[model samples]
Target: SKGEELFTGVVPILVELDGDVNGHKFSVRGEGEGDATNGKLTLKFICTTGKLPVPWPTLVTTLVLCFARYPDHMKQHDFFKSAMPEGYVQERTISFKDDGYYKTRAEVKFEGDTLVNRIELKGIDFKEDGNILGHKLEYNFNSHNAYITADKQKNGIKSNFKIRHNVEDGSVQLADHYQQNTPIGDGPVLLPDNHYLSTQNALSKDPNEKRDHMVLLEFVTAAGITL
Candidate 1:
């Protein structure tokens, strides 16, 4: 019942993430495109917000590797091979002129009008002195889901995480661990296992509040954190 025409044609996309990070407003951009059929997706993005608890280059590097397919190595991807159906890997189909710019080119195949099973992304970075950076991203539209996994020992991060969203039942869940050890001296919160799972959704009044609502489903060692 979803993802029929959203990706048809030369679908250009620009995702503007507008929100508050630790109470500071931030807007990050994710711009890209999709060809009509058996196409490619090129993404250009920027991540700039208030001082993060982590390093920017370290963070963005892992981020770009997650979003795009740098360190590509997926010549045998189950579905991607069908979408980007060429015998062997081709030179990166795009170039960068800016510092934070990266491109992802692949043949995005569609089953009729609906997207195929899924597109999986896996990448890793190796550096001197025992520094390793790696991440995995799972993306799909037809059977809709958003899953992400990142485990990095380089770019100054030692965080490990995984999250998944299932559209069939509108179920969303994730679990992550960060040994931040920031100067602010903040320790991670104890996630009360649903085990180690949580959710959100709620609110408003005054003449019906314009038919709006808000909710915050949570499981951080407490009950009734719903909004």
Candidate 2:
């Protein structure tokens, strides 16, 4: 009787995005009943028009695109075992070459449970298009990874999170090259050998050249699904 009562009118929510020239913004707007009982969760995605050069069908599509291209600008990541006396540490240093004009470095720390992943894209100078000319786009993964949902109508889902490393001058250009090195998910990573990050620095102040870099980390559910 209690289980029946608890399951009375529970419903799934939906995810959506509002895209603009600045970037894409997303949110979930729905409520479900039966707050006491754990229910099956589903996620859906909707893309708004007029946002970026690429428009993805779902959040997962966006994530795949990001990963697919991430390796292009970057060179081989050096895996190192820390010899520090105090602690045993493992890390990697990822380097990137921009349009054959500038060089930069980025660092990443990985783990299974933590939501935040540290990253630093540094060494480039700020240009008009927000593209770093001689510097790197560096930052930490302060939150969960952006991802797409399997179910197209579920709530609390997003396509992917994109952190902007724009030039202070405000020039905007799509970073087209991402290096492909390792195999992913039972398949080979695609590529065209070596490619630069940017072709040219922004010419004007409003359209300064800059970097568009992001650390991809996914959100995992606490409960393990079982048959």
Candidate 3:
């Protein structure tokens, strides 16, 4: 009954943000259930410094994309590979460009039981703008972990940021020394102080029975402090 039990209860989402970049503080919140097999996860970002600037959303979106590849990649992992019903796989490519400047390309596909996703930014070279950057990410379903590396060249100076996440433990490690834990689901409360954040909804005991299912989350910083 393990498989059935897994879907019998509600699932909570967890997120966190630490450190600052360009004078901006960042945070993330998400909600979803049923794991990668049959779940709906929505992530929202919050950027602040007293007041949010017009470009905050764009900047957040770019950084978020650094790890946004996880949800899709999970569908191909062992956890969801066998749980996926028929017709859940799709192959697609999308492109956008304008004024012979700023351009992007995205590709998604399923190769055998593995999912392959790729994104490319064109027109703006990371070496020239000093502001342009790119990320390369990889996920390991066997370990329920993911890794990200971002690189950029500014003013002839190269900089890189690396991060790793342990999905099962709800922990994220930035660079090498900075780490934080934001446990969700049945895990014990891991946030510091009283900065807990959560949301709940109803679930059905049966297809025709009505019951309540909850979605919740806790946020923290790389210092292991609540956010």
RMSD of 2: 18.6
- Residue 138 Cα positional deviation in candidate 1, in Å, after optimal superposition: 19
User: For model 2, how does the per-residue alpha-carbon lDDT over 1-227 read when each residue is reduced to its tens digit?
Assistant: 22122123432222222222223233212111111122222232222232222212111212211111122123121101111011111112222223221111122111221111111112222243333333333222222232322212321112222323333345322232222112212221122222222111111111331322121223222111222
Q: What is the lDDT of residue 71 in candidate 1?
A: 17
RMSD of each: 22.5, 18.6, 20.1
Q: Which runs of model 2 end up more than 4 angstroms from their true locations?
A: 1-112, 125-172, 181-227
Q: With candidate 1 superimposed using the best TM-score fit, by how many Å does residue 223's alpha carbon deviate from the native?
A: 36
C-alpha TM-score for every candidate = 0.24, 0.20, 0.24
Clash pairs of candidate 3? 130-154, 202-212, 202-213, 203-211, 203-212, 203-213
Q: Which candidate is the best by lDDT?
A: 1
Name the candidate, 2 or 3, with the larger TM-score value.
Answer: 3
lDDT of 1 by residue, 1-227 (tens): 02223333555444333333223344444445544333334444444453322112222212211112211232121112221211111112111111111122222223343222121212222222121111121112111112222112321112223323222235332222122111111222111111111112111123542322111111111122232
lDDT of 3 by residue, 1-227 (tens): 23223332333333232323233343322223223323323333333223321122122212211111123222221221222111111111111111112232323223343233233322322222121121121122111122211112210111122323222245332222111211112312111121111112222122441322112221211111122
Residue 61 lDDT in candidate 3: 17
Alpha-carbon error at 95 in model 1, in Å? 35
- What range of 10 consecutive residues in model 2 has the weakest lDDT sum? 78-87
